[PDB]
Design an enzyme around this catalytic site. Structure first.
Site, PDB file in Angstrom:
ATOM      1  N   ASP C  70       0.728  -1.258   0.000  1.00  0.00           N
ATOM      2  CA  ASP C  70       0.000   0.000   0.000  1.00  0.00           C
ATOM      3  C   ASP C  70       0.757   1.308   0.000  1.00  0.00           C
ATOM      4  OD1 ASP C  70      -2.738  -0.872   0.089  1.00  0.00           O
ATOM      5  OD2 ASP C  70      -2.451  -1.534   2.156  1.00  0.00           O
ATOM      6  N   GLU C 197     -11.671   6.632   4.939  1.00  0.00           N
ATOM      7  CA  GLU C 197     -11.977   6.854   3.532  1.00  0.00           C
ATOM      8  C   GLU C 197     -13.347   7.391   3.200  1.00  0.00           C
ATOM      9  OE1 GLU C 197     -11.148   2.718   2.603  1.00  0.00           O
ATOM     10  OE2 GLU C 197      -9.021   3.161   2.413  1.00  0.00           O
ATOM     11  N   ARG C 212     -16.061   4.407   5.951  1.00  0.00           N
ATOM     12  CA  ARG C 212     -15.812   2.988   6.215  1.00  0.00           C
ATOM     13  C   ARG C 212     -15.448   2.808   7.682  1.00  0.00           C
ATOM     14  NH1 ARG C 212     -10.688  -0.047   3.220  1.00  0.00           N
ATOM     15  NH2 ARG C 212     -10.133  -1.596   4.844  1.00  0.00           N
ATOM     16  N   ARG C 290     -14.585  -8.729  -2.277  1.00  0.00           N
ATOM     17  CA  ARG C 290     -14.817  -7.560  -3.131  1.00  0.00           C
ATOM     18  C   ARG C 290     -15.178  -8.025  -4.535  1.00  0.00           C
ATOM     19  NH1 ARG C 290      -9.675  -3.882  -0.964  1.00  0.00           N
ATOM     20  NH2 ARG C 290     -10.702  -3.368   1.051  1.00  0.00           N
ATOM     21  N   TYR C 324     -12.923  -0.595  -4.316  1.00  0.00           N
ATOM     22  CA  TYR C 324     -13.364   0.681  -3.760  1.00  0.00           C
ATOM     23  C   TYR C 324     -14.432   1.335  -4.622  1.00  0.00           C
ATOM     24  CZ  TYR C 324      -9.738   1.094  -0.158  1.00  0.00           C
ATOM     25  OH  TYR C 324      -8.989   0.926   0.968  1.00  0.00           O
TER      26      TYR C 324
HETATM   27  C1  LIG Z   1      -3.893   0.968   6.882  1.00  0.00           C
HETATM   28  C2  LIG Z   1      -5.225   1.725   6.681  1.00  0.00           C
HETATM   29  C3  LIG Z   1      -6.049   1.275   5.427  1.00  0.00           C
HETATM   30  C4  LIG Z   1      -7.421   2.007   5.316  1.00  0.00           C
HETATM   31  C5  LIG Z   1      -8.539   1.548   6.280  1.00  0.00           C
HETATM   32  C6  LIG Z   1      -5.152   1.498   4.143  1.00  0.00           C
HETATM   33  N1  LIG Z   1      -4.821   2.921   3.988  1.00  0.00           N
HETATM   34  C7  LIG Z   1      -3.534   3.304   3.767  1.00  0.00           C
HETATM   35  C8  LIG Z   1      -3.259   4.780   3.550  1.00  0.00           C
HETATM   36  O1  LIG Z   1      -2.568   2.556   3.731  1.00  0.00           O
HETATM   37  C9  LIG Z   1      -5.851   0.956   2.846  1.00  0.00           C
HETATM   38  C10 LIG Z   1      -6.194  -0.572   2.948  1.00  0.00           C
HETATM   39  O2  LIG Z   1      -5.110  -1.250   3.644  1.00  0.00           O
HETATM   40  C11 LIG Z   1      -6.206  -1.083   1.467  1.00  0.00           C
HETATM   41  C12 LIG Z   1      -7.483  -1.748   1.054  1.00  0.00           C
HETATM   42  O3  LIG Z   1      -8.349  -2.052   2.022  1.00  0.00           O
HETATM   43  O4  LIG Z   1      -7.796  -1.965  -0.116  1.00  0.00           O
HETATM   44  C13 LIG Z   1      -5.858   0.147   0.592  1.00  0.00           C
HETATM   45  C14 LIG Z   1      -5.031   1.073   1.528  1.00  0.00           C
HETATM   46  N2  LIG Z   1      -5.044   2.468   1.090  1.00  0.00           N
HETATM   47  C15 LIG Z   1      -4.050   2.946   0.427  1.00  0.00           C
HETATM   48  N3  LIG Z   1      -2.963   2.241  -0.018  1.00  0.00           N
HETATM   49  N4  LIG Z   1      -4.079   4.276   0.074  1.00  0.00           N
END
Ligand SMILES: CCC(CC)[C@H](NC(C)=O)[C@@H]1[C@H](O)[C@@H](C(=O)O)C[C@H]1NC(=N)N
Ligand SMILES: *[C@@H]1O[C@H](CO)[C@@H](O[C@@H]2O[C@H](CO)[C@@H](O[C@@H]3O[C@H](CO[C@H]4O[C@H](CO)[C@@H](O)[C@H](O)[C@@H]4O)[C@@H](O)[C@H](O[C@H]4O[C@H](CO)[C@@H](O)[C@H](O)[C@@H]4O[C@H]4O[C@H](CO)[C@@H](O)[C@H](O)[C@@H]4O[C@H]4O[C@H](CO)[C@@H](O)[C@H](O)[C@@H]4O)[C@@H]3O)[C@H](O)[C@H]2NC(C)=O)[C@H](O)[C@H]1NC(C)=O
Ligand SMILES: *[C@@H]1O[C@H](CO)[C@@H](O[C@@H]2O[C@H](CO)[C@@H](O[C@@H]3O[C@H](CO[C@H]4O[C@H](CO)[C@@H](O)[C@H](O)[C@@H]4O)[C@@H](O)[C@H](O[C@H]4O[C@H](CO)[C@@H](O)[C@H](O)[C@@H]4O[C@H]4O[C@H](CO)[C@@H](O)[C@H](O)[C@@H]4O[C@H]4O[C@H](CO)[C@@H](O)[C@H](O)[C@@H]4O)[C@@H]3O)[C@H](O)[C@H]2NC(C)=O)[C@H](O)[C@H]1NC(C)=O
Ligand SMILES: *[C@@H]1O[C@H](CO)[C@@H](O[C@@H]2O[C@H](CO)[C@@H](O[C@@H]3O[C@H](CO[C@H]4O[C@H](CO)[C@@H](O)[C@H](O)[C@@H]4O)[C@@H](O)[C@H](O[C@H]4O[C@H](CO)[C@@H](O)[C@H](O)[C@@H]4O[C@H]4O[C@H](CO)[C@@H](O)[C@H](O)[C@@H]4O[C@H]4O[C@H](CO)[C@@H](O)[C@H](O)[C@@H]4O)[C@@H]3O)[C@H](O)[C@H]2NC(C)=O)[C@H](O)[C@H]1NC(C)=O
Ligand SMILES: *[C@@H]1O[C@H](CO)[C@@H](O[C@@H]2O[C@H](CO)[C@@H](O[C@@H]3O[C@H](CO[C@H]4O[C@H](CO)[C@@H](O)[C@H](O)[C@@H]4O)[C@@H](O)[C@H](O[C@H]4O[C@H](CO)[C@@H](O)[C@H](O)[C@@H]4O[C@H]4O[C@H](CO)[C@@H](O)[C@H](O)[C@@H]4O[C@H]4O[C@H](CO)[C@@H](O)[C@H](O)[C@@H]4O)[C@@H]3O)[C@H](O)[C@H]2NC(C)=O)[C@H](O)[C@H]1NC(C)=O
Ligand SMILES: *[C@@H]1O[C@H](CO)[C@@H](O[C@@H]2O[C@H](CO)[C@@H](O)[C@H](O)[C@H]2NC(C)=O)[C@H](O)[C@H]1NC(C)=O
Ligand SMILES: *[C@@H]1O[C@H](CO)[C@@H](O[C@@H]2O[C@H](CO)[C@@H](O)[C@H](O)[C@H]2NC(C)=O)[C@H](O)[C@H]1NC(C)=O
Ligand SMILES: CCC(CC)[C@H](NC(C)=O)[C@@H]1[C@H](O)[C@@H](C(=O)O)C[C@H]1NC(=N)N
Ligand SMILES: CCC(CC)[C@H](NC(C)=O)[C@@H]1[C@H](O)[C@@H](C(=O)O)C[C@H]1NC(=N)N
Ligand SMILES: CCC(CC)[C@H](NC(C)=O)[C@@H]1[C@H](O)[C@@H](C(=O)O)C[C@H]1NC(=N)N
Ligand SMILES: [Ca+2]
Ligand SMILES: [Ca+2]
Ligand SMILES: [Ca+2]
Ligand SMILES: [Ca+2]
Ligand SMILES: [Ca+2]
Lengths: 388, 388, 388, 388
Positions: C70, C197, C212, C290, C324
């Site tokens: 990520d 988010e 979320r 998903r 998403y």
């Molecule tokens: C650790 C917190 C998570 C959000 C609840 C995490 N956010 C970040 C900035 O890392 C997301 C999550 O791990 C991933 C997903 O659920 O698809 C995307 C991921 N988001 C991003 N890479 N931008």
């Protein structure tokens, strides 16, 4: 915007400085670069661009095979940003055809492309990116034009065309266009006996074109046009410094009103700046092939039949391939004079390098300096072995 | 538009935040990215772009072999959109050459490129994308310039050039350009004994340049220019925090008016922001090679010969390759002060990674923050093994 | 230009029509398409574009290996023309980072990118394509934001951030920006227990965000912001139609002021349009993964704890991968109402398709129609087998 | 800008000159060119562009397999610069769908795309690059439209749609749009018995469309629309020179008000210019397959049931593949008349060339000349063998 007028004279040429270079064949070895030939440079009031006849395939593409051929249905006049290579994604098509010319009149650009079979070709004259006028072949034998920029004065843009044999008498016409329409045309007059691919420039309301006598002459014909009177004269560069290719060795006296003999039925597009003592001629270094390129200062070359060089500059070494060359100027620059510029087509592939099945080129272009600058040589730079 | 004037002072630098990063070598592993070196960043009134010297080939192209070489005919100054990689299709050529500088004066941009063989190089000064002035080599030994942006004040844009030995006394000149024309030039004065690749910034009508003493000094020379009087001074950063590379270990007292000894005939382009207690110096972490990069807050580094760090920020870990670094600012931003910015060239390939036959780089760039922000490290990120 | 004001209400949503689709993974199988994730859509007054977080490599590039990760230093917020794929050559970098949001206020665009290690991340707020403000992590645990567009009213653009655990109480803040500067910020209030988010939209001077709850809730938290008073409230969508993923099966009564239990420490970004009887919720079809995507008309979902669907539309079949989803609107369109729009990220690669070593996505986006239009399903369309 | 009005008549057509050609299949053999079909050309007041339905994959991509299929979720209407090929990087998506039309009204452009399954398709009408109106299928059987440009007069842009069987009676409607909104619609009237893919042009406040009777007729139906009264008539081209394909051999007398029999349930999009003695019809040379293309001057073809050719021009040899053809004009050119133009889709791949697994095309386009120009033939030019 107003139509540009040729109100300035040429700047004093004391040397040449690098202006643009696209390294197209080097870059094209691993990127989507179009196969081209017959390139040139032309400026608009706000930008200067490279132009060429595409072959409608990339260099690494399998359709590059057979691109030594001059006139297919897959060619087009394209333009692209100065010094970038002609790529599939940055090349703008100006018109479709296998022979062209293009120039900006100060208001908008005129582009001319000729297409068709040898006995039934036609020119389409585009103005403001729209087709305006069409001209049918008059001698049914490869209607063709400059392969470098035309020049305009108060909206009148003269263009030189030839139709007929490339190896004997032909029918050359000078057309005077304004807003893409024909004001007048006239048959070639004067003492030039055969005209091909004129390279032109304008200064003080006069347009000078240096051409290729493909039939008999190793000296180059010169056409001088008055774009106000819409009249012209023709002769040959008198100097014994011979500038076509192939050509015999230089004599001590040239010919002013007849072709300098020794080589028949062949030649190469070239150019000159003819301005009294501020006269510079370009030529290949080799007398036998399109190899090397040099600029020679030859005071009064146009009118002095014993004139020899008083200064020079090597552009491309004789161990590197050259090709067509032509004149252009940025008529919209600042200052009190027009800076002479030229390009050299660096041909790669067939027929000189026949381990590859294609023919393409890269471009190198220089403009004059009033300083006496050091010289370098500017090869295409690609390694043929990498394309095998 | 009016010429920009350096009316503001520097913002208070309490930390550095990420500004741009192109990941060029990673992306270029499978896309048409040009091989570059000597990058920099420069802003126009409406946009900021990345600049570099292309090598006239893509990284995956076979012509990438041999790109450790510094000065071929296939190089050019190119610019491209902030944080995109320098690709064949998005790179705009500014001029042809193997040494450059470029800056916007508020009205239009001046770009300078030097080309030619070692003993006969020449600079071409472009203004409003047209060639205006040319300067011939004066010492016949690699005429060369900044490799990062110049700075203008009321249309006057000073530029530092060097011609002569890189490992002994040379002839450094400060040229004052206005609309691409030479107003004046003067030989280097002051106590700096050798100058290379100055990195400059402007504030309160004064331009400060931090340079590379390639001959004897591991402390960096500093040139301060008054662009109104068109005069300058030179000295060295007095601090014992030595910022060239390679270099000896830091002493407790530096030298203000002479090169700090220990390492000869080598160096790396670098920069500093010298503003009293708001002084920050960049340097490689390694004393022996172009590895790592850090910013150190060294109050009064320019004038205090015992000054040591009071704060710092790691930019690139010592286990990652770095390279040239330089200063630039967005002189057209909003607010009451100029935000200091810098870039670091992340060199990949030869000579440190000789399993590949090329040399290229990616760019990382930061600007100052008045907050005390957390730090991260910013490596090039490409895996050399993928290119084998 | 003047700042945009949220003066209109939502148009009546009777069905959804196709708006954009980039087919990025299909096209990227043989073209230089960047690996992305976390996409969204956002409009300027004269254009609407796709946005996403690049991974700084193409999909066919060897650096695609490991792109399930990520937060690397090689990520950036990029934008590109509506429905084209995010390519190396058409993608504009907005800022560098691994979490973002962006919105246009009617005059210019604000873009926010967060970068840094987990314990020391920082946000950089860009306005008019220049960095203006920086915010340091406040809870030292992955400072992060929306991953979809923010919304502005009279220049005030509220943004929701979270810092702290993703699986327990965290510190969520609502920042109110104007011209990239902080006017005010406030800690989350109301009954939402965890926020991540947020997907937002504006109508009649009120901004509604659907978020979320990654900790305990399978119902989605809702934040409603008054951008004039710069105040907000929070609660959960009361309806028993649960819209997070994974989630338990739908009950007959939901929860308005507490997380609907059954699934912990997981979730997916999603959205809703909450407008009385004109209320539509999006959700994955699968309760476990998903996969699939559907829109359900659920009158008074926000306030009625027994509300069930009265109409629906399938967007993506349950046999196809989704991901998403978020809201955006063209606030500068003609007419008397704002047309609700949304996008769905179609995730391909890891972890569901582990025969490839990368993770990327394509985008599909729809807007509402006042007609009752026929439905189709819109899969990514790429064949994983081709990438092996 | 003001809405364009059809105030001029057609220029006298004495021959056709080359206008544009993209050589897409040749170029696409080694560059990222999108697979397309159903192309057309359409002008804005300042530019003319090529349009087509992409298949959402490049030609060399593995997803090219199966692109003979007509209606997937991966299609979209795209436009790109005149004579360049439709590449991933230069193609602008206008809307998503598998059937389209587009036209500029003098102020901005309207584009229409239809998507959905066979029994539930819907049209989305875009205006000024935003979705404005949506129309649901009325006969639940492949709602579909022109596949070439529409024409506007004083802001009213009529569009012909068909829904229902392609091989029997269907429900054809003429919609009159203004600023993307429906002013009125009417069911087909007149004697044309089946309508598909109308090719239209406008002159002297009347719009003429030449269509494809896929059910029974080998003569083409003609719809003539009055865009002020918002009324129309329909009939067939009376001439015995039959212009659909496949078709029976030409008879000596045609049919004006009924389909000319001999071939059922098949056809090809085509066009004509019907202007008294200045009437020219296009058609494939072959009566059995989409091979060759020629223009025939057939005075009074619309109303004279024995009219035969008085002049002609070969466009594509019968030994080369052709395909759809349609009309467009540059309504914003200079001069006193509108110059008739047309394009021919040069289909390559399946089903005629089944050694490859894809179906794509290139484009050739011509405009009329008042000169009697020589003719050439204009093939696609790609070698199928290279793609194996
Ligand atoms: C650790 C917190 C998570 C959000 C609840 C995490 N956010 C970040 C900035 O890392 C997301 C999550 O791990 C991933 C997903 O659920 O698809 C995307 C991921 N988001 C991003 N890479 N931008
Ligand atoms: C740093 O850079 C600077 C700037 O560039 C360098 O200085 C330049 O140096 C150049 C090379 O010496 C020089 O160019 C030459 O200029 C000559 C003219 O100057 C001399 O004569 C004048 C007149 O008397 C004097 O005033 C002057 O002081 C000099 O003495 C030209 O004559 C030169 O061209 C001829 O030679 C070259 C080979 O070097 C040929 O290629 C060229 O075609 C010319 O020769 C052919 O043509 C003539 C004319 O017909 C014949 O007489 C002759 O026999 C040759 O013919 C054969 O070859 C041709 C071509 O293949 C063929 O067609 C024919 O049939 C025959 O086979 C040359 O142009 C620059 O002027 C000079 N610039 C300045 C400002 O000083 C400096 O060296 C660099 N420094 C370093 C350290 O490198
Ligand atoms: C979250 O992020 C925040 C913000 O970034 C993090 O906080 C930052 O933490 C950094 C690391 O600790 C820190 O940077 C250091 O700052 C020091 C200055 O502060 C200290 O001194 C002052 C003055 O007394 C005090 O007021 C202050 O409170 C501190 O005590 C610098 O001195 C540090 O630099 C030196 O160390 C590093 C190694 O860490 C070297 O690379 C660097 O070159 C410096 O050391 C060399 O140079 C000096 C000067 O000559 C020599 O004296 C010394 O021996 C070293 O020399 C050797 O090495 C060099 C380089 O190779 C070589 O040339 C030479 O010959 C010798 O071999 C360092 O810059 C930030 O200031 C701090 N920021 C803030 C706002 O707090 C926080 O940690 C993060 N959180 C987490 C959890 O990670
Ligand atoms: C041409 O196109 C048109 C236009 O698109 C097509 O017409 C559309 O047809 C759709 C499909 O039938 C239809 O969508 C459905 O609408 C239902 C609402 O209408 C019905 O109820 C109302 C209220 O009484 C009546 O007024 C109305 O007349 C109808 O009777 C929804 O209820 C439907 O959604 C539910 O079903 C689908 C499966 O089809 C689920 O995926 C969806 O999630 C909903 O069901 C779950 O959720 C509810 C709520 O909690 C539960 O009660 C239920 O048990 C399900 O729960 C399980 O599944 C979920 C999801 O996996 C899981 O989370 C849970 O735990 C359980 O396991 C559906 O939305 C359109 O409205 C209709 N449009 C129009 C305008 O007519 C037409 O068919 C096309 N023509 C052709 C020929 O194809
Ligand atoms: C340089 O370029 C110039 C300019 O292009 C060249 O000159 C052009 O030359 C063309 C070729 O000769 C010529 O085109 C022909 O024009 C004919 C009309 O002119 C003649 O008739 C009129 C009327 O009487 C006279 O005034 C005139 O002087 C001429 O005598 C057309 O009739 C020609 O078309 C027919 O022939 C071609 C084959 O060549 C077919 O493809 C075409 O479809 C037409 O024939 C079919 O259709 C008719 C009508 O039903 C039938 O009667 C006939 O039997 C054919 O039907 C079969 O074939 C079709 C098609 O497959 C099928 O559907 C059907 O069922 C049957 O099987 C042709 O169009 C240009 O007009 C002329 N231009 C000028 C300005 O002069 C010059 O040659 C070039 N120079 C060189 C050296 O190359
Ligand atoms: C080139 O010279 C022509 C001819 O003198 C100039 O044309 C005049 O332009 C002015 C300004 O538009 C008009 O008022 C006159 O009607 C034009 N025509 C003539 C014949 O006088 C033209 O302006 C000059 N170009 C430039 C750039 O100055
Ligand atoms: C959004 O509402 C604000 C607040 O009323 C409007 O702001 C006024 O704009 C006019 C025009 O520029 C100025 O004369 C006023 O000074 C502005 N400020 C205030 C507080 O009144 C703004 O114009 C509205 N936006 C649009 C697009 O109409
Ligand atoms: C047959 C007449 C020739 C000019 C004297 C011929 N011109 C054309 C239009 O075909 C040129 C010549 O054959 C080639 C060359 O000498 O390099 C280029 C070739 N020019 C072009 N392909 N445009
Ligand atoms: C010989 C003098 C050197 C500067 C002190 C040399 N400069 C030039 C113009 O060649 C640089 C040096 O050799 C290289 C490096 O140190 O990285 C880059 C190289 N710079 C460039 N290739 N532009
Ligand atoms: C089923 C009805 C057909 C038209 C008479 C059919 N139209 C559509 C929208 O599918 C066309 C026909 O099948 C194909 C062809 O004849 O080339 C193209 C195909 N057209 C498109 N794919 N856009
Ligand atoms: Ca000759
Ligand atoms: Ca040094
Ligand atoms: Ca490639
Ligand atoms: Ca959850
Ligand atoms: Ca038919």
């Amino acid at each position: 915007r107003d139509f540009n007028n040729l109100t300035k004279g040429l700047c004093t040429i004391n040397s040449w400085h690098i202006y643009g270079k696209d390294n197209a064949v080097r870059i094209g070895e691993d990127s989507d670069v179009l196969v081209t030939r017959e390139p040139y440079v032309s400026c608009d009031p706000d930008e200067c661009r490279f132009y060429a006849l595409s072959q409608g395939t990339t260099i690494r593409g399998k359709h590059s095979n057979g691109t030594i051929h001059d006139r297919s249905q897959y060619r087009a006049l394209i333009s692209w940003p100065l010094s970038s290579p002609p790529t599939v994604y940055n090349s703008r098509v100006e018109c479709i055809g296998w022979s062209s010319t293009s120039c900006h009149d100060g208001k908008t650009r005129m582009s001319i492309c000729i297409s068709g079979p040898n006995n039934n070709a036609s020119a389409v004259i585009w103005y403001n990116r729209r087709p305006v006028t069409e001209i049918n072949t008059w001698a049914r034998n490869i209607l063709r034009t400059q392969e470098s920029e035309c020049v305009c004065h108060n909206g009148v843009c003269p263009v030189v065309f030839t139709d007929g044999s490339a190896t004997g008498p032909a029918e050359t016409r000078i057309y005077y266009f304004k807003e893409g329409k024909i004001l007048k045309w006239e048959p070639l007059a004067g003492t030039a006996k055969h005209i091909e691919e004129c390279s032109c420039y304008g200064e003080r309301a006069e347009i000078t074109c240096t051409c290729r006598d493909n039939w008999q002459g190793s000296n180059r014909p010169v056409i001088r046009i008055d774009p106000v009177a819409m009249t012209h004269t023709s002769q040959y560069i008198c100097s014994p410094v011979l500038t076509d290719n192939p050509r015999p060795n230089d004599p001590t006296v040239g010919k002013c009103n007849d072709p300098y003999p020794g080589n028949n039925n062949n030649g190469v597009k070239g150019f000159s700046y003819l301005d009294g003592v501020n006269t510079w001629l370009g030529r290949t270094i080799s007398i036998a092939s399109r190899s090397g390129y040099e600029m020679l200062k030859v005071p009064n070359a146009l009118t002095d039949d014993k004139s020899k060089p008083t200064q020079g500059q090597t552009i491309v070494l004789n161990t590197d391939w050259s090709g067509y060359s032509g004149s252009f100027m940025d008529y919209w620059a600042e200052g009190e004079c027009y800076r002479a510029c030229f390009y050299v087509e660096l041909i790669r592939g067939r027929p000189k390098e026949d381990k590859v099945w294609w023919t393409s080129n890269s471009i190198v272009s220089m403009c004059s300096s009033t300083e006496f600058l050091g010289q370098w040589d500017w090869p295409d730079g690609a390694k043929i072995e990498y394309f095998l």
